[PDB]
């Protein structure tokens, strides 16, 4: 399984683990306490952009 994470470039620790317990132990005192989202790939980018009647897409 470790080779599968490496060959798919899923090198974000605990992304494919449903309960990233190791991620909670490291963030017990972190600023913006958060754990990685499930199955997050370091290459995916879901960013969007729109143009409105106002500026800055507002």
């Amino acid at each position: 399984e470790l080779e599968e994470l490496t060959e798919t470039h899923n090198y974000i620790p605990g992304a494919k683990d449903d309960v990233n317990l190791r991620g909670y132990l490291a963030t017990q005192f972190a600023w913006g306490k958060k754990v990685i989202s499930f199955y997050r790939h370091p290459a995916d980018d879901f960013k969007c952009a729109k143009a409105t009647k106002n500026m800055l897409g507002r």
């Binding site: 490496t6 470039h9 090198y11 290459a43 980018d45 960013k47 969007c48 952009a49």
Partner: protein, 140 residues
Amino acid sequence: MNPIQKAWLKILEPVSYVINEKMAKRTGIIGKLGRFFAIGPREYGVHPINRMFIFMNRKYMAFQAVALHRYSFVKSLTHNGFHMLRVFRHFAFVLPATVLAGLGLFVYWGDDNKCYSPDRFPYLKKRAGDMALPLNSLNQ
């Protein structure tokens, strides 16, 4: 054990018979001397340099796979495959180019391997016996 050790055995086959059978058990000092220079499997015969290469080769290769396995900058231009907004797509081929440049790490090591050294000042010092010379020696 490796082939080079086996080659020594066929050459030292008669020598082993003299030390291990005759000297290693005759008596007294001839025994201590024959049992000390015994011939057989090498105790602590591992070669750390061989292993050092195997480790660094494997560790550096795992880095090549990461640096070389990148999404294409060309395919992201059409906004039709897997990439709409990639504001750092122009960084895709930096690490690959950096790894391919690593093939010249040892080919071009030191100043002498990057130019014609006889036209450089350090060459004069080596031919003068590694001796300090005035900086304008190449002109006079």
